[PDB]
Curated annotation (Swiss-Prot), chains A, B:
EC number: 2.3.-.-
Protein name: CAI-1 autoinducer synthase
Family that this chain belongs to: Belongs to the class-II pyridoxal-phosphate-dependent aminotransferase family.
Enzyme class, first EC level, given as a word: transferase
A molecular-function term among this protein's GO annotations: transaminase activity
Function: Required for the synthesis of the quorum-sensing autoinducer CAI-1 ((S)-3-hydroxytridecan-4-one) which probably functions as an intragenus signal.
Matches recorded under InterPro entries: Aminotransferase_I/II_large, AON_synthase_class-II, PyrdxlP-dep_Trfase, PyrdxlP-dep_Trfase_major, PyrdxlP-dep_Trfase_small
Gene3D superfamilies for this protein: Aspartate Aminotransferase, domain 1 (3.90.1150.10), Type I PLP-dependent aspartate aminotransferase-like (Major domain) (3.40.640.10)
UniProtKB keywords: Acyltransferase, Aminotransferase, Pyridoxal phosphate, Transferase
Cofactor: pyridoxal 5'-phosphate
N6-(pyridoxal phosphate)lysine PTM sites in chain numbering: K233
Gene: cqsA
UniProt cross-references to SUPFAM superfamilies, sorted A to Z: PLP-dependent transferases
Pfam families: Aminotran_1_2 (PF00155)
Amino acid sequence: PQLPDFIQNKIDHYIENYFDINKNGKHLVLGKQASPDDIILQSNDYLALANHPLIKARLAKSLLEEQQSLFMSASFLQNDYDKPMIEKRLAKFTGFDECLLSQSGWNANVGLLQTICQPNTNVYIDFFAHMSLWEGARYANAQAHPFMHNNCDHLRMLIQRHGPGIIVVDSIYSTLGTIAPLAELVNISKEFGCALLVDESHSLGTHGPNGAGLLAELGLTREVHFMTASLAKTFAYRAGAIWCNNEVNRCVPFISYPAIFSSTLLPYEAAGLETTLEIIESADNRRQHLDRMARKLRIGLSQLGLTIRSESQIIGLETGDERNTEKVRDYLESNGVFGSVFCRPATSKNKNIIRLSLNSDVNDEQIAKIIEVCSDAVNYGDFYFR
Amino acid sequence: PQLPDFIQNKIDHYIENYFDINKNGKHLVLGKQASPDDIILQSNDYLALANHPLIKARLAKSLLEEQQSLFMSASFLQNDYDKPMIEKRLAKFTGFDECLLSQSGWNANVGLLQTICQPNTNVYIDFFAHMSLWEGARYANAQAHPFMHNNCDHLRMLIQRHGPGIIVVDSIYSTLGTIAPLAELVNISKEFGCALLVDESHSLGTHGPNGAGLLAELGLTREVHFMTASLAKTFAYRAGAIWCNNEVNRCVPFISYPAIFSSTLLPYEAAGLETTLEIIESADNRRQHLDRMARKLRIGLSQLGLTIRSESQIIGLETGDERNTEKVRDYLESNGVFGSVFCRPATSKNKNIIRLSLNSDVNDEQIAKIIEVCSDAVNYGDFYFR
Ligand SMILES: Cc1ncc(COP(=O)(O)O)c(C=O)c1O
Ligand SMILES: Cc1ncc(COP(=O)(O)O)c(C=O)c1O
Ligand SMILES: [Mg+2]
Ligand SMILES: [Mg+2]
């Protein structure tokens, strides 16, 4: 049937201004198809566990077991005997008191914020913190106060003005790969009587003792109120989790709308995560190699005069406007380097990022090639870098 | 660390008013543990497919295959070669032009509404429509105009007053099991130049030719703009889908925040759905049996004086306030009948429901037993039904 004018107008306008403008007629994030020979730096699977035979075996085994039909809200599954062992193990892993499974990192953040916020609750959020955190705050009708990226001085002034609130940060930032000043943030939380929420999606598994994370690495675990993470990065699974050093996870399952009104992870999924955790705990070798390759790439690109703000395995090439970003993308892909285009609504219109996500399967030769491709891009490329 | 007052006060109040007041000290939804002999009416797996040997085998096999590391946004996977066969099959199944997979039914609704709504778009939503639709409208900053349940007069008045917009309904309602007046809603949409969105979460698989849904059953497919569904009901899988009789699914992947910022389903998950679809297509006998059992139950309960608004496999026992609901729940569970308590925020505080979700494994003896238990419950004097 015919669409009403206001919907048709929106779709017509969108296709013109987001698909039709680009050379290939597709959205800016969609370039050319990658060949087997190309270097792919797009996946969040940092320790290259997507195809791990032990994970696949345990997941298949658990699925083939007699399946109880648990197609329902997790609200109904909160009796002690119905809660999955993975929660207790992830809590022990990170050093937090309690863990609660969620269907996504997005839902973990939205759910936690809905539970701990009242309307007009002060939420002090890093300008570059994940969209799920910004949205979580917005859905709860909290008062969001952005602070300049990693700027503790700016943060202090905001809390001085508005009073006690929730300080919200990524441990490692999704677009830039910068690291939050977690120690200073803990100090500030104490200095002003705030709660701290740290999203460790990009540090859990890759950082800390046995991959326990950045809070564990810095010995700050017992001074942080909340941590969250997508399990779709290093844990290579479509899920999320909320950790609390308090009783909040007793309440989340009955308060969070995504936790109430969206279906639970099935029991076999929880079992697969148990194996993933064991593999991650022992993956000292992969973590070290990733760390070394990441440092090499950061040093190599910084030498070219490129702005590389990263301190991690996530490297952000800052490519300015969309037209320029299309050029940089086309050049890199033409020379066998496939990153991820980060544009609006993930960034502002004129501050786009081509994100290179490193994983432990990337070797010295590939690292050298990336620097080589970027060097030719700086010197011979008909485009700029911010 | 101890929580600051602004959180602690909320949590304290919540525990007091939602956990402490109940006899067992737990949330209202949490009763006693069921025995293997008990009648369990809690799962949305209407055709009892959770333990189907063929589905399990297809998933495990596709899981054990060589997996590509696709842990990223689905926006990066919108090339024709990256889009799954299940989407084309599901579109043919329902008779809709195009289908787009989502991570949940919740995400399907939230994403679609974000794509087709502008700020202040009129959204005419049934009082009892699923929370995901209410929230999808709220996130999009749409103007919600709630209409009395299944009340086309109230809807007509609202659209005359506020103008063209989007009419949003469940085909079969999640708490009451009532059926939307879909033919009349199609007429109203045409008369007033509105778009119609129908959530078929509770009719897809159970109703229509080969389980194609209620729109298909009524021959209304080609007159409806959008249909959505959780695949976590009859399809017994943690996913959702958006169907369009237009070009909107071209745009959803790049606009919807869950589609953009949350990880996609993996290829093996899609293959599992293909097998599930085939089984559902041929499950005529299961559909027929469920339909017969559900009618038998509604007849049996309604003659006892209970209000039973249902016309489907979802049967809502209307139990009034929370104190009454607790007593009803306890009686039913003590006598071997386990439904799901639906209370706030899913219902009003004084209009709680104990939902009986029937499935095709339920037999005549069990239906007779439920009727017997409720017959004795009516005469017991400890509580009431509405
Ligand atoms: C009518 C209706 N729509 C959407 C959903 C969302 O389903 P899902 O569990 O796949 O998120 C459900 C609730 O779970 C539902 O009952
Ligand atoms: C920092 C951060 N937090 C949370 C999420 C949400 O992850 P998920 O894909 O599991 O919804 C992501 C985005 O993918 C992320 O990068
Ligand atoms: Mg990310
Ligand atoms: Mg439901």
